[PDB]
Symmetry: D2
Subunit: 127 residues, 4 copies
Amino acid sequence: SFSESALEKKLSELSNSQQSVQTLSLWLIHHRKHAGPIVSVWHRELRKAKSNRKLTFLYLANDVIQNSKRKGPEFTREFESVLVDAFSHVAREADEGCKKPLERLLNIWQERSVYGGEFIQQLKLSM
Amino acid sequence: SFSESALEKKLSELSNSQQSVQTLSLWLIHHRKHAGPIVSVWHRELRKAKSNRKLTFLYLANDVIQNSKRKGPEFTREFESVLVDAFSHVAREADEGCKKPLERLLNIWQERSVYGGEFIQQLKLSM
Amino acid sequence: SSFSESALEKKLSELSNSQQSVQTLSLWLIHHRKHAGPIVSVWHRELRKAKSNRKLTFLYLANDVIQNSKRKGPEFTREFESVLVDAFSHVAREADEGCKKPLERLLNIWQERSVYGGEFIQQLKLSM
Amino acid sequence: SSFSESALEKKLSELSNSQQSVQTLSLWLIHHRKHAGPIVSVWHRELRKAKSNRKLTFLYLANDVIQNSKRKGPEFTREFESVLVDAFSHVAREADEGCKKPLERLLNIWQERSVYGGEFIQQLKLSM
Ligand SMILES: [Cl-]
Ligand SMILES: [Cl-]
Ligand SMILES: [Cl-]
Ligand SMILES: [Cl-]
Ligand SMILES: [Cl-]
Ligand SMILES: [Cl-]
C-alpha cells in the first residue's frame, strides 16, 4: 500500500543496480492515484540526496513518465511542474564536485605520502 | 608473459568490476622489470580511452604505485614523469562532458516526444 | 551516424549499465530499424562474447528497443522474438556458472597480497 | 570529523563500489584507530544488513584498512582477524543464495510490462 513513509524508504534504497529504477517505477505507477505527493516527495528527496545519488532520481523520473503514458497523463503533468527546477539543480551539482574523485585521490596520496608535498602541489595546481 | 600487446588488451578489458583494478595491478607488479613501457602504454591508452574509462586508469596507477613500493621504487619514479599530464588531462575531460548524462537524457526526451519542444528548450536553457 | 555492423559492435562494447547509455544506443537502433535482422544477430553474438558482469545490460537494451520500437513498426518485436528466450537462457546459465567469480577474484588478490598467514586463506577458501 | 558509531554507520551506508570511496573511508578509520574494536563491530553489523550487491565493497574496505593500518599499529590487523573469516563466509553464502536475484528482478519487470504474450514469460522462466 502507498504511504509517503514507504516512498521515502524506497527512494533511500534506490541504488545503482540495473533493476533498481524500473522496479521502483512499477510501484510508483501502480500507485499513480498519488502522482502529486509522489512527485512532491521525489523532488524533496532529490534535493536532500547526495551528489552521486541525484542522477538516478532523474533516471527514475524518466522511466516513470515514459511508462505512465499508457495509463494516464497525471505523472507527465505532475513532473512537468518540477522538472525545470530538478534539471537545473542536478546540472549545477554535477559541475560542483565533478572532479570530486580527483580531489579525493590527491587527498589519499597526500595522507599516505604516495609522493612528496611539492609533487602533490603540482598535481593540485594542474587541476 | 609480458607483451605491450598483452597490456593493451588487459587495459582495454579494464572495467568497473571491483576486482578489475587490483587484478591488473598484480600482473603489472609481477612484470615490474617493464615499468617504463607499462607506464608509456598506460599513458597512451589513458589518452585514447573514452571520458568514462579515464578515471579507472588513475585508480589503476594509484593501486600499482601504492603496492609496488614494497618491491621497488621503479613504478613510483616511472609514474612521476607522466602524472602531472595524466591528472590535468582527466580533470579537464571530467569537466568537458560532466553533464553528458543530462545532455543525453534531454536528447532521449526530445526524440521520444516525452515533452513538447518548448518545454525541452526550457530544460536545455536551465543547464 | 550511418548503419554498419562494425559501428554497432563498437557501440555495444562501449554500452554501460547506465540508463542513458542503454536508451541512447536504443535511439540509434530504432532509427536504423531497416536493419533489425542484422542488428539482433550482432546483439546476440556480442552478448555471448561479453563478460559475465556486462551480459545483463544487453537484456535491458533489448527490452528498451522492443517497447519503444512498437510505435515505429513490428520489425524489432518480430526479430527479437526468435532470440530473446535463448539470450535470456544464456544469461541464466552463465550467472550460475560464474556466480563465485567476484569472491574468487577477491581471494586471488588476498592470496597474493594479504599480510595474514597461510591458514587464514585456507579458512576463507573453505567458507566457499 | 570526530569518531562516533552513528557517523561510521552513515559513512558505511554512503560507501560506494568506487576505489576513491573505499580509500577515503579507510583514511578516516585509520585516523580513528583508537576505536578499532567498535569500528570492526559496526562494520560487521552493517555488512550483514547490507544489500547483496553492496556486501563485496565491505570486504575491499576491510583489506584496504588492514594493509594501510600496519605502519600505524597492529590494532586493525588484530580486530579484523577474529571477524574477517565469518564476514567472508557470509558473503560466500549470500552470493549463492541471491545469485538469480538480478534475473528474477528483470523477469518481474517483463511480467508487468512486456508486450509479448504470456507463453514467452513462461519460456524465459523455464530457462531458469
Ligand atoms: Cl501517506
Ligand atoms: Cl508500469
Ligand atoms: Cl613487447
Ligand atoms: Cl602485488
Ligand atoms: Cl526511439
Ligand atoms: Cl591511512
